[PDB]
Design a protein around this ligand. Structure first.
Ligand code: JEY
Ligand code: ZN
Length: 448
């Protein structure tokens, strides 16, 4: 057999022993692993190609396999006895040592010089803005009682979803750039990769639940108010997080969470299972986008048709708000001005609904901050649109599309996706007046 193929063969068997269900499956895979490691010991590596045989260059990697095959021999002793959990454990100890004397053997891959600084600078920016920005968001929702009440409890759920990733995966990835490889165990590999899944998927579905809430608060305002919220919203916030965990469990059976040298981060592999990947691209993207687009489309047509707009009085200045109605005069909160009967008079001066001019301005803060929550979604779709397309190309034709996906393009997609984590609070401050106010209030309180 070859040497590069010998590296690819025993590395494939290393995935089989993991997903194996019995000791005979493990024993069989360790047989194909002992012979492949021995045939690699006969071959000459590319790094010590011009070096001498007795030299600690070619004789250096010779004892590396002696440590390896000996460890396999200890691992198949357990497998022979029937101990599957014991033999699979010793195989992970075979994995940690093998990676420490494999990077010393060959260097096939070639990362373009710009990935290391780009990725790291992006990560540094994102982590710094994510930790500060989404923390202010949490504090402002938790301190402001009127703000939190306006279905903005989902914003906390989303802020933590952004936050968690800045605290565990993002800093580890930055160590993996500076050390040119995964400096942590297989333990921290799949764990960091899993935290990323929760973040990315949890964010889509949180954005989805906000899209539904604002659809039902503007278009079904009457029926909406009939339906409680008190114990409702914490239940859906919990439910969406459990739905996410479930969506992420096939990764442990399909083995799609390993280190990606292209993006220097231990993440989800599109090739590992094209079926699961295809599902991930629908369930965690195409489907929420499809349902969220319907929701904001139905809002924008109502905003276009002049419905759910404020009507300011020409005489005393009283402003009608469809969100509040005029309940003491028999008009319920959620009733549009166009819907109040012609006999209605101003609750402050007494002039009829004939001398009431509408507010032409459709400010972001209006209708529970609908158009700013909209922007948040658009930005999400922009950042995650390329990667999900790359995932879609691979899920369909891996034989023709997968080797035709440029490395330089794949990095650009993960760069955008990583950048999303810090952006959400910035958009709140630029459009939403109340958040901006609260951001200022916190900073002012911190300097006094
Ligand atoms: C469901 O299993 C997981 C598990 C871990 C994952 N981590 C990421 C990800 C994190 C940051 C930036 C971009 C992608 C995805 C999203 C991966 N989506 C695609 C289409 O490849 C992910 C998925
Ligand atoms: Zn008036």
């Amino acid at each position: 057999a070859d040497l590069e193929d010998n590296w690819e063969t025993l590395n494939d068997n290393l995935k089989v022993i993991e997903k194996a269900d019995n000791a005979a499956q493990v024993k069989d895979a360790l047989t194909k692993m002992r012979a492949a490691a021995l045939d690699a010991q006969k071959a000459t590596p590319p790094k010590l190609e011009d070096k001498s045989p007795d030299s600690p260059e070619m004789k250096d990697f010779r004892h590396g396999f002696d440590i390896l095959v000996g460890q396999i021999d200890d691992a198949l002793k357990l497998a022979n006895e029937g101990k599957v959990k014991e033999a699979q454990a010793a195989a992970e100890q075979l994995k940690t040592t093998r990676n420490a004397y494999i990077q010393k053997y060959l260097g096939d891959g070639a990362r373009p010089s710009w990935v290391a600084p780009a990725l790291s600078a992006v990560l540094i920016v994102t982590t710094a803005v994510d930790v500060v920005g989404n923390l202010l968001v949490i504090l402002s929702v938790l301190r402001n009682r009127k703000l939190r009440n306006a279905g903005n409890l989902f914003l906390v759920s989303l802020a933590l979803a952004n936050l968690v990733v800045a605290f565990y995966p993002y800093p580890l990835i930055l160590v993996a750039i500076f050390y040119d490889g995964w400096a942590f165990g297989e333990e921290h590999c799949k764990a960091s990769a899993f935290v990323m899944g929760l973040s990315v998927i949890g964010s889509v579905w949180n954005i989805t639940a906000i899209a539904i809430d604002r659809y039902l608060y503007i278009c079904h305002s009457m029926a909406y108010h009939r339906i409680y919220r008190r114990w409702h919203t914490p239940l859906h916030i919990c439910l969406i997080w459990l739905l996410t965990v479930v969506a992420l469990l096939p990764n442990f059976f399909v083995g799609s969470l390993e280190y990606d040298p292209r993006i220097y981060s231990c993440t989800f592999i599109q090739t590992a299972s094209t079926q699961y990947t295809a599902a991930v691209v629908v369930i965690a993207f195409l489907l929420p986008i499809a349902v969220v687009s319907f929701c904001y489309l139905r809002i924008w047509v109502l905003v276009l048709q002049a419905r759910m707009k404020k009507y300011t009085c020409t005489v005393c200045g009283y402003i009608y708000n469809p969100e509040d109605g005029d309940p003491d005069n028999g008009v319920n909160p959620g009733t549009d001005f166009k819907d109040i009967p012609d006999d209605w008079v101003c609750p402050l001066c007494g002039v009829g609904k004939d001398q009431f001019e509408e507010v032409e301005c459709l400010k972001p803060s209006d209708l529970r901050s609908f158009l700013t929550m909209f922007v948040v979604f658009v930005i999400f779709a922009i950042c995650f649109a390329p990667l999900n397309c790359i995932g879609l190309a691979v899920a369909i034709n891996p034989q023709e599309m997968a080797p035709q996906i440029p490395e330089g393009l794949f990095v650009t997609s993960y760069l955008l996706a990583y950048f999303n984590s810090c952006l959400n609070p910035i958009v709140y401050g630029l459009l939403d007046q109340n958040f901006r106010r609260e951001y200022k209030r916190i900073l002012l309180a911190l300097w006094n």
